[PDB]
Design an enzyme around this catalytic site. Structure first.
Site, mmCIF file in Angstrom:
data_model
loop_
_atom_site.group_PDB
_atom_site.id
_atom_site.type_symbol
_atom_site.label_atom_id
_atom_site.label_comp_id
_atom_site.label_asym_id
_atom_site.label_seq_id
_atom_site.Cartn_x
_atom_site.Cartn_y
_atom_site.Cartn_z
ATOM 1 N N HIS A 103 0.810 -1.219 0.000
ATOM 2 C CA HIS A 103 0.000 0.000 0.000
ATOM 3 C C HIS A 103 0.839 1.264 0.000
ATOM 4 C CE1 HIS A 103 -3.158 -2.787 0.891
ATOM 5 N NE2 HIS A 103 -2.665 -3.068 2.084
ATOM 6 N N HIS A 136 5.238 7.028 6.603
ATOM 7 C CA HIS A 136 5.074 6.616 5.222
ATOM 8 C C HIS A 136 4.558 7.818 4.443
ATOM 9 C CE1 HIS A 136 1.161 6.198 7.081
ATOM 10 N NE2 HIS A 136 0.757 6.711 5.933
ATOM 11 N N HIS A 182 2.012 9.086 0.857
ATOM 12 C CA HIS A 182 1.058 8.861 -0.220
ATOM 13 C C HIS A 182 1.471 9.776 -1.364
ATOM 14 C CE1 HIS A 182 -1.765 6.968 2.724
ATOM 15 N NE2 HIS A 182 -1.109 7.767 3.537
ATOM 16 N N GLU A 221 -3.352 13.503 0.312
ATOM 17 C CA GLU A 221 -4.646 13.082 0.827
ATOM 18 C C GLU A 221 -5.432 14.310 1.274
ATOM 19 O OE1 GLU A 221 -3.767 9.485 3.378
ATOM 20 O OE2 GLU A 221 -4.656 8.718 1.528
ATOM 21 N N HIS A 281 3.116 11.079 6.358
ATOM 22 C CA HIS A 281 2.403 10.827 7.607
ATOM 23 C C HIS A 281 3.352 10.214 8.617
ATOM 24 C CE1 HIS A 281 -1.643 10.549 5.338
ATOM 25 N NE2 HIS A 281 -1.264 11.795 5.588
ATOM 26 N N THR A 337 -6.653 6.927 7.001
ATOM 27 C CA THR A 337 -7.045 7.168 5.617
ATOM 28 C C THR A 337 -7.018 5.905 4.760
ATOM 29 O OG1 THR A 337 -4.810 7.653 4.985
ATOM 30 C CG2 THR A 337 -6.158 9.523 5.720
HETATM 31 O O1 LIG Z 1 -3.337 8.336 7.866
HETATM 32 C C1 LIG Z 1 -3.150 7.192 7.529
HETATM 33 N N1 LIG Z 1 -2.266 6.724 6.603
HETATM 34 C C2 LIG Z 1 -2.389 5.363 6.512
HETATM 35 O O2 LIG Z 1 -1.741 4.643 5.763
HETATM 36 C C3 LIG Z 1 -3.454 4.922 7.490
HETATM 37 C C4 LIG Z 1 -2.866 3.998 8.531
HETATM 38 C C5 LIG Z 1 -3.166 2.643 8.502
HETATM 39 C C6 LIG Z 1 -2.616 1.776 9.429
HETATM 40 C C7 LIG Z 1 -1.763 2.248 10.398
HETATM 41 C C8 LIG Z 1 -1.453 3.585 10.441
HETATM 42 C C9 LIG Z 1 -1.999 4.460 9.513
HETATM 43 O O3 LIG Z 1 -3.874 6.182 8.076
HETATM 44 ZN ZN LIG Z 2 -0.955 7.740 5.548
#
Ligand SMILES: O=C1NC(=O)[C@@H](c2ccccc2)O1
Ligand SMILES: [Zn+2]
Ligand code: NA
Length: 257
Positions: A61, A91, A93, A103, A116, A195
């Protein structure tokens, strides 16, 4: 299972995760003219001097840089938060082209990517217990625009070749997340959610106003990752963002005049 494609993307998530249509979903558009300055908000305290990164993982992802969260090392405090939140992972996006990828949006503007930094509230003892709480998480969101390179990002960029496909990981010690911050810590904040599935409504969002700049070459390397596993048909890891969701009965507050 869930992803970002036509048949399993954001418009489908509600079938398995009905909270996708909930009352405090993320991301949102930040309408800057209606986000009110809140003079009671405090400066954000980002204490990352003792951060211990461990590993980088392609989870199909995004890619996550994971930290030792077994003790109070890297923590976020202050701002809108009560207590102490420990950094567990960061991570990004990002998009297939520079005009999309974030996002959150700002007056409908999409940035090329969004970082994030995920933290959990230490009063709940572990991340799994924190995600059962409406104040369990704090995510620090930072926009990326394409321009000059971000030196502190290059070590991440250079390891991506080794985690091309879902399920691959690599040792990633001694990475300093302070090198991903912008100069200013002025922010917007609102209550929201993860998200991605499971879309849990646990997050105090703290979105910095100042983007960081990264180079075209840096973001191009993100776009060479794969959603698929090794030996499966290649699907480039691009456009792994959820669109803005309804604000509903929430208010976005600004830390700055
Ligand atoms: O803001 C987010 N980005 C993501 O990938 C999602 C998220 C999913 C799982 C753990 C931590 C965060 O929530
Ligand atoms: Zn995220
Ligand atoms: Na408002």
């Amino acid at each position: 299972h869930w992803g970002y494609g036509k048949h399993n993307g954001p418009e489908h998530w509600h079938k398995d995760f009905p909270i996708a249509k909930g009352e405090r979903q993320s991301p949102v558009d930040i309408d800057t003219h209606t986000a009110k300055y809140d003079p009671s908000l405090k400066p954000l305290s980002v204490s990352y001097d003792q951060a211990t990164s461990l590993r980088i993982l392609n989870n199909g992802h995004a890619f996550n840089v994971e930290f030792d969260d077994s003790q109070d090392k890297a923590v976020l405090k202050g701002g809108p938060l009560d207590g102490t939140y420990r950094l567990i992972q960061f991570h990004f996006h990002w998009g297939s082209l520079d005009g999309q990828g974030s996002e959150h949006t700002v007056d409908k503007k999409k940035y090329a990517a969004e970082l994030h930094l995920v933290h959990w509230n230490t009063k709940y003892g572990d991340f799994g217990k924190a995600v059962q709480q409406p104040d369990g998480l704090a995510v620090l969101g930072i926009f990326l625009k394409v321009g000059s390179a971000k030196p502190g990002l290059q070590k991440v960029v250079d390891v991506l070749d080794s985690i091309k496909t879902k399920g691959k990981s690599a040792d990633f010690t001694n990475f300093d997340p302070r090198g991903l911050l912008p100069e200013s810590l002025d922010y917007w904040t609102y209550p929201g959610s993860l998200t991605t599935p499971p879309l849990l409504e646990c997050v105090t969002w703290i979105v910095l106003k100042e983007p960081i700049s990264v180079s075209s070459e840096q973001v191009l390397k993100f776009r060479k990752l794969n959603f698929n596993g090794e030996g499966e048909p290649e699907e480039l890891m691009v456009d792994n963002w959820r669109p803005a969701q309804p604000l509903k009965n929430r208010q976005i507050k600004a830390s700055f005049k």
